[PDB]
Amino acid sequence: KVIVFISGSCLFGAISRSLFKKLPIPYTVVLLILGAILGVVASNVPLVEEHTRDVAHMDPHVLLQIFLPVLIFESAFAMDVHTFMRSFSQVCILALFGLVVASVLTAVLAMNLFNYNWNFSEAMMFGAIMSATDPVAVVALLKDLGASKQLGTIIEGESLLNDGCAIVIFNVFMKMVFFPQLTSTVGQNVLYFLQVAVAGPLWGYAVAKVTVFFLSHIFNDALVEITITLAATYLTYYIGDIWLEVSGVLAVVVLGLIVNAEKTSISPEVEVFLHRFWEMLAYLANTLIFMMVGVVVTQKALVAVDKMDWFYLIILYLAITIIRGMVISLFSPILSRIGYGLTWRNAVIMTWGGLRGAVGLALALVVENLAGNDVIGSKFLFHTAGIVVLTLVINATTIQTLLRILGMSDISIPKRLAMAGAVRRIHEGQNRTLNMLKSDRFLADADWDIATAACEISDPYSSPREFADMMEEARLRMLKAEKISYWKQFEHGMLAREALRLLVQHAEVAADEKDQFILVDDLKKSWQIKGIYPWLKRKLEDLISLRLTKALIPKLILVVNGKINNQLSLGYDVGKGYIIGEEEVGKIIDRMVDNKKILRELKHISETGRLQVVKELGLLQREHPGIAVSVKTRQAIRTILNHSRETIHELQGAGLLDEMEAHKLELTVEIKMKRLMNAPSSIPPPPPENLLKNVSWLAGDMKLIDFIKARASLLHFDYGEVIVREGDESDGLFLIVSGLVKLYGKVFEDYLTVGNVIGEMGVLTKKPRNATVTCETTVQVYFITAEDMNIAIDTFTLYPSLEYRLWRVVAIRIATPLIMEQMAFQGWTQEKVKLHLERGYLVDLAESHFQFNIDATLEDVILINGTAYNAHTREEIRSPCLISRTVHKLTFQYTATEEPRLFVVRNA
Amino acid sequence: KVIVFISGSCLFGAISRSLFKKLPIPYTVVLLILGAILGVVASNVPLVEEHTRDVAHMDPHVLLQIFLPVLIFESAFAMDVHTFMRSFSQVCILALFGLVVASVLTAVLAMNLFNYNWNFSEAMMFGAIMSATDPVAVVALLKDLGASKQLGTIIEGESLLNDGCAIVIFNVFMKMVFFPQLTSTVGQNVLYFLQVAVAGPLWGYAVAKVTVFFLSHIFNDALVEITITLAATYLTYYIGDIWLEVSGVLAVVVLGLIVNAEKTSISPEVEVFLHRFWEMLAYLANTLIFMMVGVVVTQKALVAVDKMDWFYLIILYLAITIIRGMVISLFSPILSRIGYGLTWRNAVIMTWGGLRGAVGLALALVVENLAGNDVIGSKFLFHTAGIVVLTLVINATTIQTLLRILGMSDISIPKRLAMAGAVRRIHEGQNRTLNMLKSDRFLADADWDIATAACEISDPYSSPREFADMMEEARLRMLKAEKISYWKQFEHGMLAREALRLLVQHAEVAADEKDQFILVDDLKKSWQIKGIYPWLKRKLEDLISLRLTKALIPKLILVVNGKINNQLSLGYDVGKGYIIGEEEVGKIIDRMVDNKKILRELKHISETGRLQVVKELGLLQREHPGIAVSVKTRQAIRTILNHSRETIHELQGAGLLDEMEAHKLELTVEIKMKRLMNAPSSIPPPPPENLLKNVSWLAGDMKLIDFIKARASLLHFDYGEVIVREGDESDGLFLIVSGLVKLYGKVFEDYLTVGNVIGEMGVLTKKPRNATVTCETTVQVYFITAEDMNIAIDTFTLYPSLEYRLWRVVAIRIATPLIMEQMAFQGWTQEKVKLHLERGYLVDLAESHFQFNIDATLEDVILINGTAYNAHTREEIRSPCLISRTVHKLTFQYTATEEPRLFVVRNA
């Protein structure tokens, strides 16, 4: 009969989870105490003894084969994969060497001090039974105070590897000792060790790849893949169990890590369902094992203790703490020299941040039960229970106090000001909406005292010298603007999460150190990982280019392509993100400070960084076309789909569409995105004719396309060639089809790329050229004579006229800076302003008889070229300019040498 | 050894779910076929027989105690509870009598035709083994075509009750037959029947209430309550099993229904996790039982079949179909007379909408195994398998064809036009965003052919006569406007989901029938349920007002309080939603149609409905104060919290606040909402002094409150008393503190309530009174003389002046109609316009020296009283008016008899 015991264990777990939250110590200790109470009752009353004599003394097989795999698999599921793989080498070598040192030193201490007849293998059992740690309570404590999530990942990963190594060592030593009939020669022992080393994780990886490939073919089905994932985990556990008695847990851990790594092939709802399911199973097993071990230790272990044996555990705790501190203190300089060093605070937290959790108690129970009626099992269980019940309270309380007294639990001043601003805004909004609602003719009867009191809110957080402070405050303002620009870019969907995290980390580490802005050296190092051996592998196999090896070649090809493609995508993303952010800062910081040389320094730094990054990115695009084409196509499709989804949501919110149909369209869009995620890694570049067909003002009609193709000429130029200088008429119109081109002319300097037309302005107004063109590489260009351009534009007079298209494009491309300079308050992005200008339409002066009247319907009005006269104010207007909202009567003259153009933005 | 069998069963279920979706017939048939194949292999190869001789021949106890409770409990969990409780009586009586008739007629048919030696009990066995249905495939087919969701609710509920009754009958007859040692006298048989009837569901309800009360005390913990819910279900299953062999399933069903009913005490994430968990378990059980019964029927049942036995199957199918049709055809007129009648389409669908699912196969397996080596078990299993394999294909295909040929697979024309409009808008948005993105200087290299092709979208759906068509189109336009107004009101958070469903149902049933609008009689019947018997029980137990009953009284009082409070809240919500929607519709169709008599009819109908509903709602508020106060306070708190959450989300979207802090504030707001949900059902009304302190222009300053209280007088009036007429100076200002008051004066007519001040306009401009005041009940009023009013207003000259407050309030209350009349395009609500006017501020003419200039910064400008002269246009402006955006220079004069006031709206 067991039912009452497990039911009571679940109830007590719920009670100790609910009622014991405000105390600093974890709930589990309370559970242990409860078990102790039951034990003494089980000693006296025979009925409680009869009801506990079934789970109290349970077979070692079920515990060692069930309670351990669940715990170790849970410790390897909630782990973030990318952060762990960032610093896997450091954490694994640290955990391995720490466990080795701890085991050997605990063994020699057991020989020296414990004055027993313990053998060598018993000493390593007693040493490696407490080296394993299960510090889920550390993560529970540092979920809020652990600002550096890298520290949380490190403290979880080191514990995970320590648990794995401790399980391996204990199992091999138990098999060598408690079943002495087995031979113990090295000849097959080395084979067994290498088998445990390699044959496990390889099998886990193979089955993980197989099951992910199988799951990648199921679309819109949240029921089959749950069953497939659970069966995939169980069968590998079974095979790993028959494989070796130890390799099962390692293979299961590798499977869990690989499943958690992939995200595209599994929908998020299934992922969170599996997370919750596994967490619930882990919690239930954890509660059961604490209560069972408490009952066992109180019932039998305590009656065979001695005063010296009671004194020994304090010395054991001091010894384990001092060796744990010494190993990390000694390895700190080596990891500093390698490049993955630490500091005072991280070393001190790691020194006092280890809690002996559930695995130690499980192994103590197993060895106590296998020992039988001997003093050795009682000593193991008593010592493990004492060490755990001591550390799980002392280290928790002192780690809380130490976090309080040191710099971890501090709040930055900008964060406090941001909280104050948000609280003020919320209070203002609540006040205005309450004031509005009190004026209603239907809700004037509610008792406003409790209505006001219940909805209140509160913040959870409650000269050379002048030049130095102003430059410091300007630097902090610039970094804050850069951070909010990155956040805005992320929200719009033009930038991936990982690139956002990298950029924010770079911004914070640049702001932390004195008077240093964002360094382009670290960024170019970040995307310089393209200079790596996988490319050498690809070159070797392409040079190479027994019967079944043929089909072996492309698949490897594919994964190699994949294995680099993401990397370039990431790099490219960062570059684009950075450059856009920089431009926005260069538009907003201008009117913030009024010290001339400070603006000069800021502008010089920003311009140099912009030019260097754009040059390096253009050269990288020149190096390889296919990956750039694939990344650009994926970005365009993602932006289009995101905007379409936003339009669906807005149209639903207006009530025009019911919720069923909006859900259907959203599901279709999500299916399109999922099919996008499975796109080929690289695509061959388009031919030049497609590039000619893809320009803005030669689309929608083949007549203009082949009319231009009738007389379009192709030219080629090499390095160091000057194509056009200043002080001359616009001979023709260029179009870059390959290479990279530098343009410089009178102060500003820029680098173009493929797909950008050169000198559109020079052919419309016949202005002299104002650009010097040089070539940084080989280049092919398309040349069209201006005479043919004018003949063609005089030939076509349809309503979608080519003249209108070019004037619209040049107007928007010359008017984005004008709006973004002065009218750009907080909350405006390049994308928003570009779309808002896109919604507008150009106006002609034929129907207006050279007279325009400014209404309040049109948002803004600008003049590109020409002169706009006034009558009541009589003011001259130059070109180009944004017309301020003062004059509402714009008259125009007629001039043969110039015809004015004007642009407006209207409402929807 | 079983592992390979269950693993293969799960894998085959996965395949048959994946690669068999385009076919119309359900996947389960395929599974059956697969089992058959394995069976014949198990007949020949001894190894497959050795691997399948374990699960195929399984002990009946585990099947009858595991596979049945899960299967029955799943159908009671995904059920919508409110739709089932709406029409529980009809469905339960129909299911019970249908099962009784089917069982008896199948028994007598087994007597007449089967020419066996079967007794009477075996006849009921064969009759009630196929009466049970598991039509989850019917719901799967009707999830998209069954627009009338009440049909799905009925077809699921009738199946559920049929399954329960069939289980009860089967179990009692099996216990009476296969264990003949048991006594079969009636004396304790009637006791057993009543025990199964009553003792089960009462215990289930008791434990459901206990576990919901326990779960209501846990806040922000998504792990304890999962374990508590699962343990609560299991312990009741265990106790119900020990209680009676039959009552366990009924108790578990009642527990599941009650758990699904409550929603406030359980967070939604836990709810969806339990949904997915139970669905997965049910699917696994279904796959296992199908494959096992296929193996069993192919291996042994088929070898003892005769040609006449093969011929009888068609006759049984025809007989069961005609019986199922005849019973519903005969019960149709009775349900029509009761008030829950049906029509042709529902009767025909119910006639051919029953599929014998997994429960029939389970019961056939149990009786076949208990029969042992006898022909009777083989005959049962063969007949059940044949009936299922026939109906599960024939009825599915014919129900699909019949739905296609009937009007249920039809699309309304307005839905088609809405889809066309949405598709056009999406295509336009995609085109404009692609055109904008092609002008970028960084994404000009992507091959636009695949980019354009991949993101494309397609719609899933591809004289008396003139007066008649015009009134029909006007009526449909009015109903469409009302529907979109209801949707907008629901989105803003001022109206509950259930009231929205009720109002939309009323709208569509009003639109279905010719030339009649929304009826106030049905709505008043909807909120007249407050007159339900409970109120009589409440009055009796208040009049009444052995040792432990003292604590029993208040709990009963409280549960009666809640049981009436929910209904009254629903009624009040429906009333307010309807009245706001009617005002908006009456404001928007001011210029849609241009027929005079049509406008007169529309206005008369709308005004009569508005007046009747507001009068009845005011009288209901007069009847009982406490529930009205509680509902109003809850509504105000909900609106305030929703607006605060919206401000959090907007502030996060602007990048000013990071994600963590926004999540923290959102969690705090959600906790506040959760604590709101546990508010007391009713609260006492505030004293009249609190009402005097709660007005708009006497808040935030105690000095004005006591100054008004110095000379405020109290007056009382009764029914039929006229307080003030027209043609007289404004003697004083009123304030309603109790009762209901009618005001009528020269055409318009209205009823006020408590908290609305009467005649504010008469004391500012000293205008003669234009209202006739009558009393529909007893009334108390607060009277203040105008002399004290003007003395007080001349006394106070602080910047938050009382004069400014009254002018602001009267301005917004007179200016809401002006904006809502002409400027209201699609997408504007009363709340939005009220907030937009609230953000504005009144302007004084002292600093403007009687001269104002209209900019484009201010959105709109209005004039309340006075004359606004012009100079360049020279136009006089009457009062009140909205100034059109033509004149931008507004000059003012000075007059002793009138001082003009002007209102503006500025940007943020």
Curated annotation (Swiss-Prot), chains A, B:
Chain segments annotated as transmembrane: 2-21, 27-44, 61-77, 88-113, 120-145, 149-174, 186-217, 222-244, 248-261, 269-302, 308-337, 344-371, 376-406
GO annotation, biological process: potassium ion transmembrane transport; regulation of intracellular pH; single fertilization; sodium ion import across plasma membrane
pH dependence: Optimum pH is 6.5.
Gene Ontology cellular component list: plasma membrane; sperm flagellum; sperm head
Compartment list: Cell projection, Cilium, Flagellum membrane
Region (Transport core domain): 88-175, 308-406
Binding site for 3',5'-cyclic GMP: 759-761, 769-770
Reactions the enzyme catalyzes: Na(+)(in) + H(+)(out) = Na(+)(out) + H(+)(in)
Record topology, Cytoplasmic segments: 22-26, 78-87, 146-148, 218-221, 262-268, 338-343, 407-545, 558-908
GO molecular function, one term: cGMP binding
Region described as Interacts with the transport core domain: 497-512
Domain statement: The dimer domain comprises TM1-TM3 and TM8-TM10 regions. The dimerization interface is formed predominantly by tight interactions between TM1 on one protomer and TM8 on the other. It contains an hydrophobic cavity that accomodates phosphatidic acids likely playing an allosteric role. The transport core domain (TM4-TM6 and TM11-TM13) displays a typical sodium:proton exchanger (NHE) fold with a six transmembrane helix inverted repeat topology. It contains an Asn-Asp (Asn-237-Asp-238) sodium-coordinating motif characteristic of electroneutral NHEs.
Similarity-based family: Belongs to the monovalent cation:proton antiporter 1 (CPA1) transporter (TC 2.A.36) family.
Quaternary structure (record): Homodimer; the dimerization is stabilized in the presence of phosphatidic acids.
Name of this chain's protein: Sperm-specific sodium:proton exchanger
Covered range of the whole protein: 76 to 1192 of 1325
